Design a protein around this ligand. Structure first.
Ligand SMILES: [Hg+2]
Ligand SMILES: [Hg+2]
Ligand SMILES: [Hg+2]
Ligand SMILES: [Hg+2]
Ligand SMILES: [Hg+2]
Ligand SMILES: [Hg+2]
Ligand SMILES: [Hg+2]
Ligand SMILES: [Hg+2]
Ligand SMILES: [Hg+2]
Ligand SMILES: [Hg+2]
Ligand SMILES: [Hg+2]
Ligand SMILES: [Hg+2]
Lengths: 592, 592
């Protein structure tokens, strides 16, 4: 395709986007026009594209590309976006730090979908001068790295917003047993309000970020129960948390003003006479984000924080209702969040379908074109990609319940002491995982550049089917005194499970290294390594029982109880279990 | 030996103690006499033994046995013990639950040393009716088990005291995501003061213990910072912790009175007008224990809570000074504590030397006979046994600093990302571990029934020497670009280290199963498994660097910082690091 009206910047962007767009030998002319967000009109090889914001050029061209692919000659497309800003925020704080190459790829995909803004969630994963422990061995971003990511987004006329923490959720930093860190602490993951060394740290934070072009930052500042209740209380006595939050936020905003920043934060804080007055003054100096995944921006969820497998389906359900509500309430700004809770085990690209869904709702208020446009963004079929969710999609789950994550807890639970066993239907769930493995093995064959993430999932599902088979088989066979069936498992199925887990670690490690810096993979080595050792223990214990070397396997004599009652009121068998250390063992492991 | 004056009970005890005592063909007559704790007098095969308390018969006979072994014919021994009660408390709450056979062996050894009382520290590791999650998958003791242990001690005229928790330090119980448990919580490891369901639980505790003969119990009740600051504060607003502690303790003592129990607790609490008055009333209803390991009982330390290797040497140093001070202040009761912090990795029998030390100080006020008497108790040489400490006994450490535990952190630290590296002297420490391995290999050959614990230590020390060699070798070789030296390590030393770690897990597992119930070993499988997987990663990463498949190993490019500054003021290189999850990785692992 050839163009008239391009800037040199747009020329370079189109060189980068060429592999995605298949515009062919057509002629395109560009107009800037704020009558509508996007307009595409033309026929017989000559098209005019108009956009309101420059970044919207790239979605307009995706719509053109899709329309032509559909075999249209005549094109007449018009879109008025509901939101002035549409952002995607990746988590780089949960062990998985997006590598620069992956950040670039994501920026390109977001450009094509219509996002205006890229955000990174960094608790401690950016360098601060004079704070060598901050992000120590975490793969923290250098200033040069953050600049490179920012500048790459700016090349597509996209904005960049760092999402940091200025009070709480700094657990990876505050663990260091060095005075210059411990003196910054209130309690648990919370910094000490009123400590000048804490305000020194926070100025360091802004000094790092002042090296970027952006002057928009998310400072966190959500409310935590224990704020003011640790070393603060010892220092100062008890104080109204609202009052402390007010003290702290003013200090932070004064630092931010010094570096020219505009601050966004969670609304919580703003849900005694003189503190109410303080509150009303501060609210005017900040933008608020209202979160819900299940002068106000809305934060929606792209579900990739529940283990190894995302929930694009659930994301779609809530996106549809959230979009209605945001429109009703004239919301100007939406941030789609890609959290990574408790180890960052889910692919950074696992939620491309959810991302396209939100783009479509924002621009068209429907999903009528989601497949066609997703094909431009990814080169793949949307329904294929949506099957990435399968390890969570147990047959007959209610579709409106969140967090149900058997992908993770079936994997990590013990074999001899299976804490989640009563939440598993051993035939029904096993057959689902077995079938899912087959479906994903086929998709991976046609997934191209994304095949690697489908391979991980195919292997997980096959691993889960066999793990349930062996685990539930042992419980039955042991209860019924069937040493013959136990010997068979020990001889054939155990070595097969062990090998499958090893192969799964090798595949996951390929996925991780493709997407993330190497830092953080180590926690997963530990978890996989522990699982392997426990599988081996299970085999060994059974062998000793079969051979008569022990008279019973005490693990298998224990009554198993429900793991939690989170979905007891809804009557589910499956559940949500999303902390590895509570899934893997009933013993102490972190505690003293 | 033949006896006059024995009860049938004493007859049975002497049958059990026969393998330890080598009295030969002598004649012994027994007298009860409170003029002194113990008296042994006689010659030419005829001896008279007098004791004040019945249990002291067994130490008296140990002293006789030792005196005869020394080739004495004429014996004239007299001892006046400084303390009316001398107790040993084993930890059964840190993952390692002493099995019944080991409890019996320990009781026999304590009898011979002169202890009056055996205690078990059980946070959640005893069954409570109607609380199925309490001790769930922990190897909690049944009532029948606690009875069997109590009765075995009573057979030697020894008392039994359960040491439980009635407010805090219930972390393994409160983690269960079930309403009937979560409703019992204040915050972290702390039960909810003022919740009637909490008082129901505590009555369950006493109901279990009321099945024993003993009516002496330790209820814990130490002070915790966050008492009253979690769900309590939400329910009730802020309260003076002293006042809450006072409210709670009265309730507990009222329950205890109902079941006939006398309660001991930590003194902390007793370090507004009307609360001071409450305090003074409650103090009269309880016995207090004053702790220091570094109407008042003293709790001394037998150091076995710092990893895989004890510190009998440090225990001796503090025992000597603590004994002086307890005598000066007319203390009537001493409890030697065998804590198991953070996984119970140290042998339950690792501290027999410390135990004999305290017995000797209590009965003789010196250690002049420690070897001779220890030979009766264990069948082994005291100085041999003291070398069990070697993995902690780095040359030139100051002998008065506690917790220095390179046995644990050299083992668990990463290879690619060694967080404790600056606290290691790679030649000096490695040579110490190498030599220690040799010394312990020789001792194990002559250790008899205890050989297994020396084998564990010999293997640990050899493992540590090689792990330092490889780890520091990689840091040097990588910094100096020496891919040849890296290839050598990958080819020879890595497989050797991996095998040594596997063999060490197999040996530790034999030690564990000898001493403990199977529950808890699983956390150690996880830790060992993770270490194995990280060793494999290290090899793999180096291989890819050597072969040119990657251009750098980013892990090895990081500046290493000190791990902590705990002993910075004293100028040490070694340190104390005693939480596995902070040693093994800088990444998040328990956090969300
Ligand atoms: Hg954000
Ligand atoms: Hg304020
Ligand atoms: Hg506030
Ligand atoms: Hg919305
Ligand atoms: Hg909304
Ligand atoms: Hg058994
Ligand atoms: Hg105790
Ligand atoms: Hg009171
Ligand atoms: Hg008190
Ligand atoms: Hg003492
Ligand atoms: Hg003392
Ligand atoms: Hg590199």
């Amino acid at each position: 395709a050839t163009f008239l009206g391009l800037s040199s910047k747009q020329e370079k962007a189109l060189v980068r986007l060429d592999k995605y767009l298949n515009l062919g030998e057509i002629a395109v002319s560009l107009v800037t026009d704020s009558a509508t967000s996007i307009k595409v009109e033309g026929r017989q090889g000559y098209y005019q594209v108009s956009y309101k914001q420059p970044h919207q050029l790239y979605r307009a061209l995706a719509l053109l590309s899709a329309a032509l692919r559909s075999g249209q000659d005549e094109v007449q497309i018009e879109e008025e976006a509901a939101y002035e800003d549409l952002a995607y925020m990746a988590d780089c704080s949960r062990n998985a730090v997006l590598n620069l190459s992956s950040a670039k790829k994501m920026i390109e995909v977001l450009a094509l979908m219509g996002y205006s803004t890229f955000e990174l969630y960094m608790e401690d994963t950016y360098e601060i001068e004079n704070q060598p422990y901050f992000g120590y061995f975490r793969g923290r971003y250098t200033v040069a790295e953050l600049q490179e990511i920012e500048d790459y987004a700016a090349d597509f006329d996209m904005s960049f917003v760092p999402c940091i923490q200025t009070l709480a959720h700094l657990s990876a930093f505050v663990k260091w047993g060095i005075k210059e860190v411990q003196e910054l602490r209130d309690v648990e993951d919370i910094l000490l309000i009123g400590e000048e060394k804490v305000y020194d740290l926070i100025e360091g934070m802004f000094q790092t970020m002042a090296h970027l072009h952006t002057r928009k930052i998310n400072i966190g500042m959500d409310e935590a129960h224990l704020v003011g209740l640790g070393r603060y209380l010892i220092k100062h006595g008890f104080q109204n948390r609202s009052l402390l939050m007010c003290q702290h936020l003013e200090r932070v905003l004064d630092i931010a003003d010094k570096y020219g920043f505009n601050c966004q934060m969670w609304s919580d804080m703003f849900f005694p006479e003189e503190t109410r007055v303080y509150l009303d003054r501060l609210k005017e100096r900040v933008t608020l984000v209202y979160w819900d995944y299940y002068d106000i921006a809305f934060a929606g969820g792209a579900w990739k924080w529940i283990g190894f497998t995302p929930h694009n389906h659930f994301s779609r359900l809530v996106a549809i209702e959230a979009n209605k509500a945001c429109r009703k309430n004239q919301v100007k700004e939406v941030i789609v969040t890609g959290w990574g809770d408790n180890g960052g085990e889910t692919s950074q690209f696992s939620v491309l379908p959810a991302l396209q869904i939100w783009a479509e709702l924002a621009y068209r208020n429907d999903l009528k074109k989601v497949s066609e446009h997703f094909l431009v963004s990814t080169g793949l079929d949307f329904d294929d990609f949506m099957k990435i969710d399968l390890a969570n999609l147990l047959p007959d789950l209610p579709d409106n319940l969140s967090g149900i994550n058997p992908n993770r807890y079936v994997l990590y639970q013990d074999v001899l002491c299976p804490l989640l066993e009563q939440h598993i239907r051993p035939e029904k769930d096993k057959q689902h995982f077995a079938s899912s493995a087959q479906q994903l093995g086929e998709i991976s064959k046609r997934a191209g550049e994304y095949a690697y993430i489908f391979e991980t999932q195919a292997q997980l599902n096959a691993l889960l089917a066999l793990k349930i088979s062996i685990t539930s088989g042992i419980q039955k066979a042991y209860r019924n005194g069937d040493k013959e069936h136990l010997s068979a498992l020990a001889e054939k199925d155990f070595p097969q499970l062990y090998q499958m887990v090893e192969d799964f670690s090798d595949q996951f490690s390929r996925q991780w290294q493709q997407e993330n810096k190497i830092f953080g993979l180590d926690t997963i080595d530990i978890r996989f390594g522990g699982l392997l050792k426990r599988i081996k223990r299970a085999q060994e214990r059974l062998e000793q029982f079969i051979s008569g070397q022990i008279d019973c396997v005490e693990e298998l004599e224990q009554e198993i109880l429900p793991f939690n009652d989170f979905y007891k009121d809804q009557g589910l068998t499956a559940t949500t279990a999303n902390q590895w250390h509570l899934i893997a063992t009933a013993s102490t492991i972190y505690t003293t």
